[PDB]
Structures are given as C-alpha cells and as structure tokens.
Enzyme design. Sequence first.
Site, PDB file in Angstrom:
ATOM      1  N   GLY A 241      67.836  21.680  50.701  1.00 64.17           N
ATOM      2  CA  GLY A 241      66.448  22.150  50.743  1.00 64.17           C
ATOM      3  C   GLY A 241      66.249  23.326  49.820  1.00 64.17           C
ATOM      4  CB  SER A 242      64.053  26.152  50.390  1.00 64.50           C
ATOM      5  OG  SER A 242      63.179  25.226  51.011  1.00 64.50           O
ATOM      6  CB  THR A 243      69.781  26.866  49.506  1.00 63.34           C
ATOM      7  OG1 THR A 243      70.194  25.505  49.616  1.00 63.34           O
ATOM      8  CG2 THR A 243      69.668  27.524  50.862  1.00 63.34           C
ATOM      9  CB  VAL A 244      68.193  23.517  45.183  1.00 64.59           C
ATOM     10  CG1 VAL A 244      69.195  22.852  46.101  1.00 64.59           C
ATOM     11  CG2 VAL A 244      66.844  22.883  45.344  1.00 64.59           C
ATOM     12  CE  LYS A 245      61.216  25.876  47.825  1.00 65.37           C
ATOM     13  NZ  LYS A 245      60.366  26.471  48.878  1.00 65.37           N
TER      14      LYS A 245
END
Length: 499
Positions: A241-245
Amino acid sequence: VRHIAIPAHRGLITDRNGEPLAVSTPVTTLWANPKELMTAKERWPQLAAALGQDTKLFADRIEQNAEREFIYLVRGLTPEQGEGVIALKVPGVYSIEEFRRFYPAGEVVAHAVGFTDVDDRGREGIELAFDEWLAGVPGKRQVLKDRRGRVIKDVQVTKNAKPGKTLALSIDLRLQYLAHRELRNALLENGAKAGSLVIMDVKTGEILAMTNQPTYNPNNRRNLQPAAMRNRAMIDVFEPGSTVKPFSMSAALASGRWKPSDIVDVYPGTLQIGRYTIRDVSRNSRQLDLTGILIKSSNVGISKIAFDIGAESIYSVMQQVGLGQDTGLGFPGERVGNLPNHRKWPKAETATLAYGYGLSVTAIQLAHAYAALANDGKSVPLSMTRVDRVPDGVQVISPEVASTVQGMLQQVVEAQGGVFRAQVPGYHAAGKSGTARKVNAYRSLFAGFAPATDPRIAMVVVIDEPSKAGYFGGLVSAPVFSKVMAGALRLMNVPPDNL
Ligand SMILES: *C(=O)[C@H](CN1CC(C(=O)NCCN2C(=O)c3cc(O)c(O)cc3C2=O)=C(C(=O)O)N1)NC(=O)/C(=N\OC(C)(C)C(=O)O)c1csc(N)n1
C-alpha cells in the site's frame, strides 16, 4: 571388514559479535547387534527398562530383527545416559559418539537460523542455506566384524573428518532480542494474528534483525504447527500500500515536472476512473502540497501525480529499488512477489501502482528499498552474513531526489497532523505508514529510517490482522518502530541528532 562414518563437527553459527546461535553438542547414539542380543535374552527386560521401552514390545522388536547385525536403540542421549546403559554390560549393545544442535537463543532467532534433522543435516533457514559450509566432510574408519556382526578391532582411521567452518551472521543478537519482545508486545496489545519486523544497516546491506510472530522453540520441535515455522519476513508476500508512495514521489521529483511545494487538488477525496473509484480516508482536503499528500496519505493526490509523470517512470524506480525483484540471498522458500509490468499502462493501473495496490512484496524487499532511499539513493546488496568488506552500491535514485524525499518523510513523522507515534526520543526519524485491506481484515505497515540527518538504520514493521479498533499503520505499527528504533540506535552508539 567394512568402512563406517566418522561424523564431522558442524560449524558454530554466531551473531555479528560472536554470540553463539547454533552449537554442536556431543551426544551418544546406542545401537545393538540383534544376533548378539539373541544369546542374552535374560538381559532384555533390564535393557528395555533402561531405554524406557515396554518389556514385551522390546522383545517383539529384537525377535523381528534377529537376522540383522544393526538396529538403532535410541538417538541423542547425553554422554552420561549413554554411559549409564553401556555400564549394564549387555552383550551386543554399542555406542556411536554423535553431535546434536543446541540453539541458545531458541525462538528469538529460529526463523533466521533454522534447524538440522536427527542426522545433523540442515533442513531450514541458515542451517539449510549454508549446509555445505557448516557440515564439513565426514571421515571413515575401518572396523573388523566377526561373522555374526560382533565389532572386535578398530583397524585404523582411513580418512579424517574435516570440521565445519564457523559462520558469523549479520544479526545483532541485542537488536534481535529487542525486536522480538516489542513485536510480541504489539501483537498481544492489538490481538494480531501474525507480524514481521526487519532492521537493515543502510550503509552495509546487513540484516541486523529479522523476527516474526508466531515463532517456535527449535530445541523442542514436538507437536508443532507449520504456521509458526514460517519466516514471514521472507516467504510471505503482501500488498505494501501507501509505503510505496515515496518511490512514486521519487519518480515525480526526478521527472523535472514536480517540486515539494507544488499543489494537487484532491477535492472531493474521490476520483472516478472508468468503472473504478480511487478513495482517500480523509476527504476534507482541496489543495495539498506533495508533503501533505504523504502526511494525509491521499491516494487521489499520488494518482494525479502518476497520470502527469506516467507509470513507466514509477515502475522503473520500484524495479530499481528491488520491489517484486529477487533479493539474491538464496534463502529457502524466499518469495520474489510481483511488480506488474505493462507494454502500455492504462489509467486505472497507473493510479493503483502509485499507491501500492496490485503489487506484492516481502518485508525484506520493503526494508531494502527504504535502505537505498536512506543511503542517498544507493542500494547496497543484502547480506545475512557479517560484512567485513562492503561491496559497491548501485545508484538507484539520484542523491538529490533521495535527500529531498528523506526530508519529506521526516515531515511525515514530525509535522502537525503527521505520524507522531513514529517519533524516536532524542532523534530525527523519517517514515511512511500503510494500511492494506486484504480480501474486514487489515495489514498495518510502517517503514522508516533514522537518524534523518545521517541515516544508519532502516526498519519495517508489519502487523497482520490487528483485532482491536486500531488497524491504521500510524496507530499499530508506528509505535513499534519508535521503541525498536530508539533501542537499536542506542545499542549501536548513534549520536542523538535531536537534542
Ligand atoms: C495506503 O496504505 C492507502 C491509504 N491509507 C490511508 C491511510 C490512512 O488513512 N491512515 C490515516 C487515517 N487517519 C488517521 O489515523 C487519523 C487520525 C486523526 O487524528 C485524524 O484527524 C485523521 C486521521 C485519518 O484520516 C493509510 C495509512 O496508514 O497511511 N494509508 N491504503 C489503501 O488505499 C488500501 N486500504 O484502504 C483502507 C484501509 C481505507 C480500507 O479500509 O480499504 C489498500 C491499499 S493496498 C490494499 N490491499 N488496500
């Protein structure tokens, strides 16, 4: 005359500082020549007692093997228990001196170290992966038997046993213990099903800690479910999820088209793409700068950035930092995950890529990616062994983009309405929360590094199915990062940069 095996001493496994993790201890195997036992039946019941065997079952066994010259009585007694039953002086009862693994840190480092079988061969973890290095080569000795299997002389040693070689792991047992306790505490505090924690040296590629819940005692493996044996940090794939942003943001700042102070309009916190709907949790925003997009974890903000720069640039940074790519550790059952590629990227897939939907990674890959970002965009190869000579890194993000993205992740942690639970007493820390709805059931993520001014350590916390009201990464995972980063920096004598 036959030739029979002299077992080799299996190499000591230590932590990076020489603390024993796997030790070969001397044990005694008892075997019997049934052809000799069949001439001393009056001795069987006493011998049966001494082996904690039943009188009649033992006698049935010797009778059934009366034609044979070898059977095992029992494996891996102490030298004392072994000597106790050899002292009964029962004809045709013999002693082989063997080695058995003992794991002084037990369940704390079971997933990484693995275990051997009763034949002292590596079957899990490091024990399997480094089995050739650790096992050494057995020896052979010449043994004269009379025509009914009686061992009389030891004629000679034909070939000497070469001992295994010592193996020093990258693991720091002090950080491993800290990591183990705090993941266990958070797991219990949140009624979580499972979780992982990985710590990396951002400068050397070394895995300083790798712990999972649940775990098992490798010293006592009896009546043991498979679930507790899984090294989830390496064999479990999840959507990050948003840890790749921050990788999406990296592509944005490297494109020439975006800088941190640039504005994206996220109103009304949804964005319809053909049939699909992109949705933010917090839907009371219009204009957000790029740091705000990360602080508010706006999927709509990163999606609009992704439309503007193209999925190809995003894919490429994610591929380069190792997401869904082979780590090359050669660790048994290690999963690669999946980074989806396209000849031509559609709109829906451009957005979902950018906020970590339809992607699969390991905790290790995610830690390695954050390690590269912390080390000014330079990826150092992963090692599970002590690194004395550090191999050259690959520059995967330009040093300036990496340094800008670090600053933004420092803000995610320290700014108003940020992930304050990730703050590390006495240090500047940086990181990103994530929350994945698995197909309700959640996975809570935090990835980060510290100190922010000169990064030393990268860390990922994954908690699977927290069962309290708190499921967001910023609630569940961030406090674990805080406590474990604090203790890790102190154990490693890293000067406080926020006093
Ligand atoms: C990435 O992980 C995305 C987006 N989530 C959102 C988000 C999050 O919303 N966290 C903050 C939630 N939140 C607060 O904690 C909080 C606290 C205060 O005081 C105020 O005032 C407001 C708020 C507030 O809004 C995530 C995060 O942890 O950073 N990231 N995740 C997804 O896009 C997917 N899951 O969405 C959710 C969890 C909302 C869902 O229920 O479906 C997702 C991505 S991959 C996958 N399988 N699912």
